[PDB]
């Protein structure tokens, strides 16, 4: 209602007090804002990290002291540049360089020539992702001077059963020879030698025409198979096709394992199969192809 004039003196000071109070509190808040700033500079912490140890391959790395499996950089002797790979290191000092991995059908393996040459999919430190390392890299790793390699194939069904297939003197040729697959011999394994071919009962030469040793690599846009048709295109994948295959680890990922003729458009078996271990109509749940210097495989 507008008080007395004798109030203006007390009222005038009350404001001068809180005004100054406000000021001091602001100077202190601005300060707190400065301290907050120093806390909001770092990026989010990425869980996936790459180790520092490098070498010619995962075994050369494991020889330098690396113990845990994860992402590493390797650079084979002839390699023009280093590249990333997933290394598997056991408690025995063995370092495997994984070049293929299937485990959930999250990655489409119907890729072209260039994609299979350079590689696709993702690499993870926990080895829980699907991928194809890339023919050129595979070629470089397995053709280093005086270092004979070996290939280990690991399968797993939808029942927890796992089997393996070893191959001595594993090798992959240069692009000039269409990344031809060759090896000295089957080294054993409860998964069976699918690379030697498989008698499908289709003809007197089913064995020979489903063998992979010596086969060049093939993709829909680059046919190098022993078939008037296009294996890679019919089965929708990239692989060392003959006419056509006994072992097809880069095939269509069939959920559940069991699939049939009706499952495909054409009618052919295009799953992740390995005839010596399961029927051509049983696609694997997990797949992994890895290599390591032969002298490292059990003495």
């Amino acid at each position: 209602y507008e008080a007395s004039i004798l109030t203006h003196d007390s009222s005038i000071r009350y404001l001068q007090e809180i005004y100054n109070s406000n000021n001091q509190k602001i100077v202190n808040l601005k300060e707190k804002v400065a301290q907050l700033e120093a806390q909001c500079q770092e990026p989010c912490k990425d869980t996936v990290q790459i180790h520092d140890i490098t070498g010619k391959d995962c075994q050369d790395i494991a020889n330098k002291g690396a113990k845990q499996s994860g992402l590493y950089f390797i650079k084979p002797l002839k390699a023009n540049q280093q590249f990333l790979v997933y290394c598997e290191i056991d408690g025995s000092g063995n370092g495997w360089t994984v070049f293929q991995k299937r485990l959930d059908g999250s990655v489409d393996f119907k890729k072209n020539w260039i994609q299979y040459k350079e590689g696709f999919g993702h690499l993870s430190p926990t080895g829980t992702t699907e991928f194809w390392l890339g023919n050129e890299k595979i070629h470089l790793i397995s053709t280093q001077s005086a270092i004979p390699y070996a290939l280990r194939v690991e399968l797993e069904d939808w029942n927890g059963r796992t089997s393996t297939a070893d191959y001595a003197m594993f090798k992959v040729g240069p692009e000039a020879d269409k990344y031809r697959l060759t090896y000295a011999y089957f080294a054993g394994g409860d998964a069976g030698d699918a690379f030697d071919g498989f008698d499908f009962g289709d003809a007197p030469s089913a064995k020979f025409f489903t063998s992979h040793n010596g086969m060049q690599f093939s993709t829909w846009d680059n046919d190098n198979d022993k078939f008037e048709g296009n294996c890679a295109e019919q089965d929708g994948s990239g692989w060392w096709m003959n006419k056509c295959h006994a072992g097809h680890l880069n095939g269509v990922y069939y959920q559940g394992g069991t699939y049939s003729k009706a499952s495909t458009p054409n009618g052919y078996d295009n799953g992740i199969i390995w005839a010596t271990w399961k029927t051509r109509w049983y696609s694997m749940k997990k797949t992994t192809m890895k290599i390591i210097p032969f002298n490292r495989l059990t003495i």
């Binding site: 498989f198 499908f200 289709d202 003809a203 089913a206 025409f209 489903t210 078939f227 048709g229 294996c231 006419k243 056509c244 295959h245 006994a246 052919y268 078996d269 199969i273 005839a275 051509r280």
Partner: peptide, 4 residues
């Protein structure tokens, strides 16, 4: 598989 084999393609006869």
């Amino acid at each position: 598989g084999h393609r006869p």
